[PDB]
Design a protein around this ligand. Sequence first.
Ligand SMILES: Cc1cc2nc3c(=O)[nH]c(=O)nc-3n(C[C@H](O)[C@H](O)[C@H](O)COP(=O)(O)OP(=O)(O)OC[C@H]3O[C@@H](n4cnc5c(N)ncnc54)[C@H](O)[C@@H]3O)c2cc1C
Ligand SMILES: CC1(C)c2[nH]c3cc(Cl)ccc3c2C[C@@]23CN4CCC[C@]4(C[C@@H]12)C(=O)N3
Ligand SMILES: CC1(C)c2[nH]c3cc(Cl)ccc3c2C[C@@]23CN4CCC[C@]4(C[C@@H]12)C(=O)N3
Ligand SMILES: [Cl-]
Ligand SMILES: [Zn+2]
Length: 664
Amino acid sequence: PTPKYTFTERAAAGNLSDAEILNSNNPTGSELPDESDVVVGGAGIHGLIYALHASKYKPNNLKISVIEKNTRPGYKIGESTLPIFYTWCKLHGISAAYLLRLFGLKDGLCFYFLDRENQGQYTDFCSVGAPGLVLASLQIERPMSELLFTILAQRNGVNVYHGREVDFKSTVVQGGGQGNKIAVSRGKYDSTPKTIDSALFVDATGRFRQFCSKKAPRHRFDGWNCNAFWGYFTAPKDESKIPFDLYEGDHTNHLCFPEGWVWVIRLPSWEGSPIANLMDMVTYILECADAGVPGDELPSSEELARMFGLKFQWVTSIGFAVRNDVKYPEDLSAYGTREAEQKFNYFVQKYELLQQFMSNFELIENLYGPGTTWFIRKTLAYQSPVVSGPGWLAIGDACGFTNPLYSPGINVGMSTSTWAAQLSHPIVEIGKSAPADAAESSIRKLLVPYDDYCKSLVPALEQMNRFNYVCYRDTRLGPQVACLWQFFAGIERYLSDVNIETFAHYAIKWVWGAMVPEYQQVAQKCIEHIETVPLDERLPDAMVDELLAFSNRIKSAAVAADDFSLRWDAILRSFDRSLNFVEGKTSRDIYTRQCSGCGAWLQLRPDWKKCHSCGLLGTEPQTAVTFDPPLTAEEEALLYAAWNTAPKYDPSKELKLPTPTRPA
Ligand SMILES: Cc1cc2nc3c(=O)[nH]c(=O)nc-3n(C[C@H](O)[C@H](O)[C@H](O)COP(=O)(O)OP(=O)(O)OC[C@H]3O[C@@H](n4cnc5c(N)ncnc54)[C@H](O)[C@@H]3O)c2cc1C
Ligand SMILES: CC1(C)c2[nH]c3cc(Cl)ccc3c2C[C@@]23CN4CCC[C@]4(C[C@@H]12)C(=O)N3
Ligand SMILES: CC1(C)c2[nH]c3cc(Cl)ccc3c2C[C@@]23CN4CCC[C@]4(C[C@@H]12)C(=O)N3
Ligand SMILES: [Cl-]
Ligand SMILES: [Zn+2]
């Protein structure tokens, strides 16, 4: 396909604002409709996942309008995504060759555990992702992901309106099929708001809980909560001076210690690009995905920036997520002038490994506009007690949130977004087909499992977060108990069988494995012991011995009961096939390489000879996926064949769950 510059030229011809050029791509028009079936407040990632999944699950059934306050897709923290997210993108028609032009490659998770009392000592836990012919994970700049899903939504019959705000003071939400009146303005100052008459309102306003807060007070869990502070840094081409052995920038890297952990995420940034030019680039990429353009014939990221007049750079997202019972010095003025900067730099100099690590990175000033060099957010975890009611439901962060760790926010949270999307079709039809009293009663009963799932979801994720945090207080418990159990309980068994029809049903059974009984049994034993040791103290060595022995005893039985075949010793660098810890083991599959020209991390497969980010050609390591232990040519062909195309929906087939097999 020849690239078109439709939006760039339309914007210049009409001198259109950012919101006006975006809204001009709507199928129904740039102005709000008088009526809709569903109105979604908020076009964050979940509001858009919801609208995309609802239209894809059953096309041409629901008229859906998404209302977003930002004039263009705004900055969000939350950049790391997991295989279930990519699978969802692939099911919606965008595979890795196209996504990697916009987003950074993610190949597994790596954890480094720093000893607080023995500075310089550390251990690690490293895993790999998948071959390029299997799947990819992504590090996403959120202004780009929300733009991608906006354009994709607009191309699938969904209207998205930026620069428009739901007025929750005058909005009326009623049950049955009686009808909502959603008031939409451009802000407080706008005294000519519009009304959308509609059947279902979806609260996707994130942590702001703009609608469901009216129905219940925000709920907090017992015990300590977490604070976060972060910033953006350069992304070094040469990672060889990082003070951790075998470090690789294309993981989501975690620097873990008693007080909390640091995330390190390498990703490309498009900041500075005009919004109209970005729409043209994204539209071109989708036209290429529609036509099936092969990766080596698709322009590279930097070539796209030249074609469409964009700005492109590599950055590292680095942030702390620490417990809010940490004692800080009263005066931190020596480390900066703002609290976020002060606490970031104070914590770095508390660990020599963190300071040696950070000395590979240069701070970026105001990457996302003035005042964005430093970010801080306090008291992260919460839950919404009420997530549905007459005429409305909530999804995503509006239901609750725990912690960045293991990225449940996007990847687990999309279970609610996609289930609500599926449920939205019968919800709307019930109201159009039955009198008001019975309609409301039938909708209420239909949503009882959705309410019950949300109610138990956040507490389970909260226990999962505390489980990892307490084990991060020791360099043996971290990798050998917490990491091991999250990977065994949470690896996505039978993901290659998921399709659009089963996606929500599968996703709600995942929960990162946090509902697995043996997982909860080990987590409760560790939490119960470690929470009795004050944070400023080292864990007694006998406590670590006992928790380790208890964990390994429960592990051996649960691993023997799992009937899912997996080359565990190839995926986890430090463990054998039976998930036994091996002290000196370093062997692992090799799925990626770093481009010598631009530093971008690449997936190895024989049909991607050039760097997808800068276009530089490689010389035969792409065919050099290293399987260790090796696979025959037939086993390798069989692996790739399983992941080629998702199977058609077979209503006779029973859904296979991602969690380990029950012991029976
Ligand atoms: C420090 C930190 C790190 C994190 N890291 C990760 C990670 O690595 N991976 C991960 O998966 N998750 C991560 N998360 C969680 C993740 O950021 C959230 O789960 C995710 O952004 C939730 O998306 P959402 O669409 O529900 O809400 P948001 O993305 O917050 O979107 C809400 C939208 O609603 C709009 N809005 C608000 N009020 C109105 C109104 N009245 N009218 C119209 N629109 C309105 C806002 O403009 C906004 O765009 C992290 C969270 C934190 C705090
Ligand atoms: C199941 C997947 C998505 C997975 N999910 C993880 C979660 C954590 Cl926490 C760590 C590692 C993984 C992996 C690595 C896997 C293991 N599978 C072997 C056959 C195909 C596949 C898919 C992929 C593969 O090639 N790599
Ligand atoms: C398990 C059930 C109760 C179920 N549980 C869900 C949870 C969510 Cl979140 C979404 C959908 C479902 C469904 C619909 C199912 C899926 N199964 C396919 C084989 C038999 C069965 C049973 C039934 C079926 O025919 N329909
Ligand atoms: Cl992650
Ligand atoms: Zn390159």
